[PDB]
Amino acid sequence: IFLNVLEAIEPGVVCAGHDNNQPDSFAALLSSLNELGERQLVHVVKWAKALPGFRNLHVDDQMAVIQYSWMGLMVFAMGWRSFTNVNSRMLYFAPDLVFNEYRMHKSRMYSQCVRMRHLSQEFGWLQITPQEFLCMKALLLFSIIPVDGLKNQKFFDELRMNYIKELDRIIACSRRFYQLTKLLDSVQPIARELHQFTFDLLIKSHMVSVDFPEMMAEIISVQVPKILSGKVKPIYFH
Ligand SMILES: C[C@](O)(COc1ccc(F)cc1)C(=O)Nc1ccc([N+](=O)[O-])c(C(F)(F)F)c1
């Protein structure tokens, strides 16, 4: 039942709308990454709200958890698409936004990109199954919380425990749980580097001709700094 649901709500293909017939430029690549990010967020929200037990969470906690986990969720799913679509040869942000090393360099996010390429390869090396991937991704949504707590922390703790239990069931074991939780933890540092980069970019966006969508700018200026300043932190297994 649980896996049937995860499979049923998994988002379909999302395109960036990037002009690939134009020579690569920092400004156009980032504007497409921003637009793609916002298009994906629409889907992440619909996906999250359809998750088993997600409605149990307080209304305000639902929005917060989605906004904080947004980057991580995208990173994890992008790594999977890279592995399944191009065997980690490139980063498959979208069918019309595929990064080769040249674009990784031109985007000024080279180190983060190489770490995501390594993540992509890990899916292959660890032989992650589509079902482990689905459960792990859902678990990522419940892996970052505020130090001062959510409106209903207890409901959040129960839900996270339940998702961990589902992972146990998919696995069923110890060595595998170790491998998967280590892989999950590796997502956070990458999301952090992307958050930092994105934060710095928005602050100087007017200096590099980068276009930030309304909702994204609000989230980067209101939520992301809570993560960067240590007020909101990820939950690591290790
Ligand atoms: C630069 C940026 O547009 C910033 O997007 C944000 C995403 C979340 C957030 F809280 C703040 C900004 C970005 O990283 N976009 C992006 C778009 C798509 C994907 N993707 O499809 O996986 C990613 C990725 F997760 F890879 F890094 C990143």
Q: Which amino acid is at 25?
A: S
67 burial via Cβ count (<10 Å: 0-12, 13-18, 19+): buried
Residue whose CB lies within 8 A of the most ligand 1 atoms, among 13, 15, 18, 34, for a mutation test: 34
Binding-site entries for 17beta-hydroxy-5alpha-androstan-3-one: 34, 81, 198
Element (H, E) at 115: helix 110-125
What's the topology of domain 1-238?
Answer: Retinoid X Receptor (1.10.565)
Residue whose CB lies within 8 A of the most ligand 1 atoms, among 26, 81, 93, for a mutation test: 93
Whether 93 lines ligand 1, by a CB cut-off of 6 Å, is yes
User: How many Å apart are CA 161 and CA 167, to the nearest integer?
Assistant: 10
**Residue for token pair 């039942």:** 1
User: How many Å apart are CA 110 and CA 193, to the nearest integer?
Assistant: 11
Cβ(16)–Cβ(35) below 8 Å? yes
- Domain ranges for the chain, please list them: 1-238
Task: Sort residue 92 into left (φ over 0), alpha (ψ -120 to 50) or beta.
Answer: beta
Cβ(138)–Cβ(53) below 8 Å? no
> Strand 232-234 and strand 91-94: pairing?
unpaired
How far is residue 72 from each of residues 9, 174, 206, measured CA to CA in Å? 18, 25, 26
Q: Which two tokens stand for residue 176?
A: 């595998």
The closest of 28, 42, 69 to 156, measured between CA atoms, is 69
Q: Give the determination technique.
A: X-ray
